[PDB]
A paper describes a structure:
Here, we present the cloning, expression, purification, crystallization and X-ray diffraction analysis of a cellulase from the cellulolytic bacterium K. pneumoniae found in the gut of the Chinese bamboo rat. A cellulase gene was cloned from the Klebsiella 10 chromosomal DNA using a pair of special primers and was thus named Cel10. The gene encodes a protein of 310 amino-acid residues, including a signal-peptide segment (residues 1–23), and has a mature molecular weight of 35 kDa. However, Cel10 cellulase activity was more efficient on CMC than on Avicel and xylan, which indicates that it is an endoglucanese.
Numbering used by the authors: 24 to 333
């Protein structure tokens, strides 16, 4: 549609990179995976193959089958950080699975299978009596704590994986991730922060190392919850918090430890997630010049989440 064409015109380079034009024009596996999902949804196989070809040739980590998470084209070494971002790897593998169905080509599913096997082998660990997906292979396993990002619990992707391969392991991860998320939540909003520290006895708190806000990571949680199951009881704190504000005066973040809220309000893609969470009817998205990469992406992912309720 028009939104997707405008998205490619503003953010997709001819080499297949998606450009975070608000963050120094960098590319990352979240951006590639988001765009690959949207390319399938718009039945745009040329764009999908360009996005995937650049991702695979440029970012593949050959030691474990995952992907270097960030590409900075102005840096002396554009792939300085050699760690992965597990939500990006997941989105890429999920887009490939959906590409097989859309275009009836098993090669996309064979590619997906390698990545999902890599995700289970290298990013999923046993901790506090549950299976948990780390945000990356390195840097998040502190000894008696894990630093987790619940916005990387991409429930609709995990369900798709389970239908294809390693059903029991992916189903257990989904069960454990819903259970952990159900135990999260702080302050008067009872919402999770972007980053959550899980201690080995099960105790959770907002992680020490980041601002303890529900903000640009955590807001994807109700998106993924509603994408997988709009009737989920895990949506309850999200609906309650958003219902306590006027639609056009909903704070863009909240500090869940102090209850301080942003002095500015959700618009664009953030507002689209709010509308999705509350079930408020919204029409197909339009990508305005006031949307950055992040807002433009969320607008279309919200629309896709609605479409997948068929």
């Amino acid at each position: 549609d028009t939104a997707w064409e405008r998205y490619k015109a503003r953010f997709m380079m001819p080499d297949g990179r998606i450009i975070d034009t608000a963050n120094g024009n960098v590319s990352h596996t979240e951006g590639q995976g988001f765009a690959m999902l949207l390319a399938v949804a718009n039945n745009d196989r040329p764009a999908f193959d360009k996005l995937w070809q650049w991702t695979d040739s440029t970012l593949r980590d050959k030691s474990n089958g995952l992907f270097y998470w960030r590409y900075n084209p102005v840096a002396p070494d554009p792939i300085a950080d050699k760690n992965n971002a597990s939500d990006g790897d997941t989105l890429i593998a999920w887009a490939l699975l959906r590409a097989q169905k859309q275009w009836q080509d098993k090669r996309y599913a064979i590619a997906s299978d390698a990545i999902t096997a890599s995700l289970l082998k290298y990013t999923v660990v046993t901790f506090a009596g549950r299976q948990v997906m780390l945000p990356g292979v390195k840097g998040f396993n502190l000894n008696d704590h894990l630093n987790l990002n619940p916005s990387y619990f991409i429930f609709p992707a995990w369900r798709a994986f389970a239908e294809r391969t390693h059903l029991t392991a992916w189903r257990t991860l989904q069960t454990d991730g819903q259970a952990l998320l159900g135990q999260m939540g702080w302050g008067k909003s009872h919402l999770p922060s972007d980053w959550v520290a899980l201690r080995a006895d099960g105790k959770m708190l907002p992680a020490k190392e980041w601002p303890p806000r529900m903000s640009f990571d955590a807001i994807r949680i109700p998106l993924y919850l509603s994408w997988a199951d709009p009737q989920s009881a895990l949506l309850a704190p999200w609906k309650a918090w958003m219902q306590s504000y006027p639609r056009l005066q909903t704070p863009a973040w909240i500090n869940v430890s102090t209850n301080e809220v942003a002095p500015w309000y959700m618009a664009g893609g953030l507002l689209a997630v709010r509308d999705l969470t509350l079930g408020e009817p919204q029409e197909a998205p339009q990508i305005d010049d006031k949307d950055d990469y992040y807002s433009a992406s969320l607008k279309q992912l919200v629309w896709l989440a609605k479409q997948d309720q068929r």
